[PDB]
Amino acid sequence: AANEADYQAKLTAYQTELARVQKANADAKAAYEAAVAANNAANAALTAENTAIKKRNADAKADYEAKLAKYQADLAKYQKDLADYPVKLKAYEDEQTSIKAALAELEKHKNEDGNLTEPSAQNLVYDLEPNANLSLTTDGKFLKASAVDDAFSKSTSKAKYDQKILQLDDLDITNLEQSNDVASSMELYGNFGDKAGWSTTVSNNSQVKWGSVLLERGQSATATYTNLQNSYYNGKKISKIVYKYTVDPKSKFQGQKVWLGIFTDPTLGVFASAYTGQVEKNTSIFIKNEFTFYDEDGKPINFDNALLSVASLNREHNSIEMAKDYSGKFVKISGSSIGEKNGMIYATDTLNFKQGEGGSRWTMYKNSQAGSGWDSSDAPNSWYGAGAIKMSGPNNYVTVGATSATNVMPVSDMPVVPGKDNTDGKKPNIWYSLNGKIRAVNVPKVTKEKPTPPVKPTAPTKPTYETEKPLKPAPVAPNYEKEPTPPTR
Ligand SMILES: O=S([O-])[O-]
Ligand SMILES: O=S([O-])[O-]
Ligand SMILES: [Ca+2]
């Protein structure tokens, strides 16, 4: 009995110890699972972040190399410009000396025929741009080239047309006013393509092209000329010119429509016409011109006394071509028929059509007389019908047109040409251009631009790389307690 009681005591003790170890190991296992979960979470995040780090580093490296490529090009350009600076500076300084010496000599001839009364160098080189590109917008109507061709082949310009000549001042615009003459985009017309070899009143047999529009008073057309090759301001290349042509509401032509032919070469200007077949008394046609020149960077050029040539200002016994409402200051050419009066630039005191008529010194067209044919691009004395306007600022303007003499002054104050009636009607049309081809003699031109120290580029910022992190080692498994041994009876 004592042994049995002793045995049961040990059995109970044993079973209690067993249960203790079991619970203890259960808690241990739970703690190990918690450590395992924490370790797995840690390595999951480390693995994911490492993948992310590899990607960020790759992108960083790629962006950096992309930047070095642009920088390398910029730096090479910088070092080149830096090396060329002295050469450009000498060229500039050397031309500046020459021009100043040239102006000094001119000062002594400023009152001789053909000389600008105010000696000045032409900082604006803008004389010929045959390869310029013309883009037009308008609040009027674009005219189809086929319609322009048809108009030239009919009415008053037909005779010349049939002789392979495009006579712009004879074009009857009546045939450009039909609704079916309107185009959706600008179309070029001229003595090219199927009409290569033809002549026109603009540049004889040289090829010219123009876009056409039909405008009413107050309406305009804006021309954007690009692809310029030979124009500069103070040696700085001119890359673009934006020019707006507006029909002056004050124009007195009888019609309500105007045809504008805008040449692709900006230096050739424009032809404006309200002519419908018959001459008109007390008539006029004026076109407002607003323009801005731009540099290679597309920035507006702020002129500092740029010389604008105003030439071919014809004055017949019944007609006066003039420039007015202009920005800038008029500069007279000594000996020229052109002067300024009441805000208008024109032949103020004499006519300039035929020698001996109304005080004209020379005949505008070529004939048997010395000096005849002054009204031509290459005439030695074209200055006889020209002047200049010194302009400053990026936005300039001037209105150019033709008007009956009777609109400008009383009949009693006009020159008398025996056999000619000063009240004769005229055609309400005109061709004119505004460029830098100063007609005065021996005018020095600026061709060397003053150089500016190049801007040194900035090397790209070194890439910021991150280090990947090592995974954490798995937690060590706990050492569970061993079970107690069963007692024996
Ligand atoms: O000028 S090309 O278009 O004949
Ligand atoms: O100008 S006419 O006399 O040749
Ligand atoms: Ca003219």
Instruction: With respect to residue 452, please indicate whether it lies within any of the assigned structural domains.
Output: no
* Tokens at 354, concatenated: 């035929």
Residues tagged in the binding site annotation for Ca(2+)? 312, 314, 321
Are residues 359 and 243 part of one domain?
yes
CA of 426 to the centre of ligand 3 (A): 14
DSSP letter for 308, please: E
CB of 369 closer than 6 angstroms to any ligand 2 atom:
no
Are residues 162 and 217 part of one domain?
yes
Q: What is the CATH number of the domain that holds 166?
A: 2.60.530.10
Handedness of CA 434, 287, 336, 106 (dihedral sign): negative
The angstrom resolution of this structure is: 1.8
Nearest by Cα to 442 from 128, 125, 120: 120
CB of 397 closer than 6 angstroms to any ligand 1 atom:
no
| Burial of 126 from C-beta contacts in 10 A (0-12 / 13-18 / 19+) | buried
Strands (E), 33-168: 124-125, 133-138, 141-143, 165-166
Distance CA 124, CA 328 (A): 14
Experimental method: X-ray
Are residues 262 and 222 part of one domain?
yes
CA of 209, closest atom in ligand 1: 1
Q: What is the CATH number of the domain that holds 59?
A: 6.10.250.2200
Handedness of CA 13, 18, 23, 25 (dihedral sign): positive
Handedness of CA 139, 247, 148, 154 (dihedral sign): positive
Distance CA 198, CA 65 (A): 59
Residues tagged in the binding site annotation? 312, 314, 321
Are residues 158 and 203 part of one domain?
yes
Instruction: With respect to residue 97, please indicate whether it lies within any of the assigned structural domains.
Output: yes
| Contact status, residue 332 vs residue 387, Cβ threshold 8 Å | yes
CB of 363 closer than 6 angstroms to any ligand 2 atom:
yes
DSSP 407-419: HHS-GGGS---TT
DSSP-derived pairing of the beta strands 236-247 and 319-324: unpaired
DSSP-derived pairing of the beta strands 387-393 and 329-331: antiparallel
Identify the bridge partners of residue 210 per DSSP, sorted by sequence position: 189, 263
CA of 383 to the centre of ligand 3 (A): 12
CA of 192 to the centre of ligand 1 (A): 6
Instruction: With respect to residue 230, please indicate whether it lies within any of the assigned structural domains.
Output: yes
| Contact status, residue 355 vs residue 369, Cβ threshold 8 Å | yes
DSSP letter for 463, please: P
Query: Which residues does 77 contact at the CB level (< 8 Å), separation at least 6?
Result: 454
CB of 367 closer than 6 angstroms to any ligand 2 atom:
yes
Instruction: With respect to residue 18, please indicate whether it lies within any of the assigned structural domains.
Output: yes
Instruction: With respect to residue 467, please indicate whether it lies within any of the assigned structural domains.
Output: no
Can you tell me which residue has the tokens 């020209």?
Answer: 386
Q: Which helix (H) or strand (E) holds 51?
A: helix 2-106
Are residues 346 and 235 part of one domain?
yes
DSSP letter for 471, please: P
Instruction: With respect to residue 263, please indicate whether it lies within any of the assigned structural domains.
Output: yes
* Tokens at 312, concatenated: 């071919």
| Contact status, residue 247 vs residue 241, Cβ threshold 8 Å | no
Q: Nearest 5°: CA angle at 225, between 447 and 249? A: 115
Distance CA 130, CA 53 (A): 60
Number of domains comprising the chain: 2
* Tokens at 126, concatenated: 């803008």
Distance CA 439, CA 449 (A): 23
| Contact status, residue 258 vs residue 247, Cβ threshold 8 Å | yes
Identify the bridge partners of residue 233 per DSSP, sorted by sequence position: 124, 236
DSSP letter for 483, please: P
3-state secondary structure of 223: strand
Instruction: With respect to residue 478, please indicate whether it lies within any of the assigned structural domains.
Output: no
Distance CA 321, CA 324 (A): 10
Give the mutation target among 316, 363, 417 for probing the ligand 2 site: most ligand atoms within 8 A of CB: 363
Are residues 152 and 98 part of one domain?
no
Are residues 295 and 279 part of one domain?
yes
Last residue of a domain, one of 85, 110, 135: 110
Are residues 400 and 387 part of one domain?
yes
Distance CA 293, CA 436 (A): 12
Interior/surface letters 170-192, b for 16+ CB within 10 angstroms, e for the rest? bbbbbbbbeeebbbeebbbbbbe
Are residues 177 and 99 part of one domain?
no
Are residues 304 and 230 part of one domain?
yes
Nearest by Cα to 297 from 239, 355, 245, 346: 239
Instruction: With respect to residue 137, please indicate whether it lies within any of the assigned structural domains.
Output: yes
Which domain range does residue 263 map to? 111-447
Strands (E), 133-198: 133-138, 141-143, 165-166, 182-183, 188-190
CA of 372, closest atom in ligand 2: 1
Q: Long-range CB contacts (< 8 A, 24+ apart) of 455-464?
A: 455/78, 456/78, 457/71, 457/74, 457/75, 457/78, 458/71, 459/71, 460/64, 460/67, 460/68, 460/71, 462/64, 463/57, 463/60, 463/61, 463/63, 463/64, 464/60
